[PDB]
Amino acid sequence: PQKPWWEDEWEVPRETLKLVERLGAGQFGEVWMGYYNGHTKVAVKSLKQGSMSPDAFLAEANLMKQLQHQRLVRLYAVVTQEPIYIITEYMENGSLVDFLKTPSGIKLTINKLLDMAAQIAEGMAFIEERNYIHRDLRAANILVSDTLSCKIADFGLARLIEDNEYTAREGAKFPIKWTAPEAINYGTFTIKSDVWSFGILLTEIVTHGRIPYPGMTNPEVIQNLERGYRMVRPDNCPEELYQLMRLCWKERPEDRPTFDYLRSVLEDFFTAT
Ligand SMILES: COc1ccc(N(C(=O)Oc2c(C)cccc2C)c2ccnc(Nc3cc(OC)c(OCCCN4CCN(C)CC4)c(OC)c3)n2)c(OC)c1
Numbered sequence: 001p002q003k004p005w006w007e008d009e010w011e012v013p014r015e016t017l018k019l020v021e022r023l024g025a026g027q028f029g030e031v032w033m034g035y036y037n038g039h040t041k042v043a044v045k046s047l048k049q050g051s052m053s054p055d056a057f058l059a060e061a062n063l064m065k066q067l068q069h070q071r072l073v074r075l076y077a078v079v080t081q082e083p084i085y086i087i088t089e090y091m092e093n094g095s096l097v098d099f100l101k102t103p104s105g106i107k108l109t110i111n112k113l114l115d116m117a118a119q120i121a122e123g124m125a126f127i128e129e130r131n132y133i134h135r136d137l138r139a140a141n142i143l144v145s146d147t148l149s150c151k152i153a154d155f156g157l158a159r160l161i162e163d164n165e166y167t168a169r170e171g172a173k174f175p176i177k178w179t180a181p182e183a184i185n186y187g188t189f190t191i192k193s194d195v196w197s198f199g200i201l202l203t204e205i206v207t208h209g210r211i212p213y214p215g216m217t218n219p220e221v222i223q224n225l226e227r228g229y230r231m232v233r234p235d236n237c238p239e240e241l242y243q244l245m246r247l248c249w250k251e252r253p254e255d256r257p258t259f260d261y262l263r264s265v266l267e268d269f270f271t272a273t
Pocket residue numbers: 023024025031032043044045060073086087088089090091092093094095098140141142143153154155156
């Protein structure tokens with residue numbers, strides 16, 4: 001189990017926090033931009049009581065206590081006496097999917113998009129090496145800093161893997177366009193499932209946040225994939241990159257490359273441009 005709150009180094013008195021601006025509001029709670037001890041800017045997630053189990057809520061906080069890296073949004077603190085809060089490192093420019101649509105994002109050069117792509121792969125390489133999987137890898141869950149660097153966020157579905165794979169529930173449902181076939185079909189996820197999602201994420205980067213598989217419904221996406229087709233070349237997408245995306249979408253999970261490999265290639269692509 002976890003150390004008791006009176007011993008957990010992560011526990012902080014609720015008095016230390018002040019919620020300032022609401023970033024998101026959902027069925028299970030809200031997320032706010034706030035301040036820790038006045039001067040430190042942070043993000044605070046609050047649990048809407050009754051919406052879900054506190055155990056269920058704090059589970060991702062506990063995983064984040066275990067998974068730490070410069071490229072992953074860092075757990076800052078936790079308040080475990082109701083109401084419950086999960087506090088994290090703050091990212092000024094929000095989600096990558098949103099940032100890419102702003103005046104600043106629209107002007108990003110392909111070189112910078114490749115840089116960011118490599119930054120993301122760098123973080124996944126760490127997750128990969130530590131025997132974890134994300135399962136929710138998408139531009140929506142990549143946050144951007146004030147210095148235009150990227151970090152992986154939302155470890156809600158993230159899981160420590162005991163021996164290569166994790167099996168989800170038969171009732172658990174996932175985003176069709178972002179999830180690997182084997183995961184949608186048998187609920188089985190592996191780091192290779194994340195590699196597939198990364199491919200999809202790449203299309204999000206080069207299209208400045210467009211929804212993958214343009215003009216296609218989910219039934220259509222699934223049917224086309226089974227025929228051997230893959231997403232159509234996005235407008236204005238370097239061919240080298242399109243081909244890297246294809247590696248991420250190979251039929252056999254084992255045939256897809258590692259995240260470290262993806263990182264190296266993207267870094268070469270970046271240094272070139
Ligand atoms: C669902 O919203 C989300 C809200 C917050 C977070 N989140 C986080 O880590 O949440 C979290 C915590 C704290 C603990 C456990 C698990 C999770 C997910 C988080 C953590 C650190 N920085 C930021 N900055 C941010 C600044 C910003 O702005 C400064 C912004 O934009 C908000 C406004 C965007 N909207 C876009 C559409 N329209 C223009 C209205 C504004 C952002 O939006 C993405 C984000 N967000 C999400 O991370 C996935 C999604």
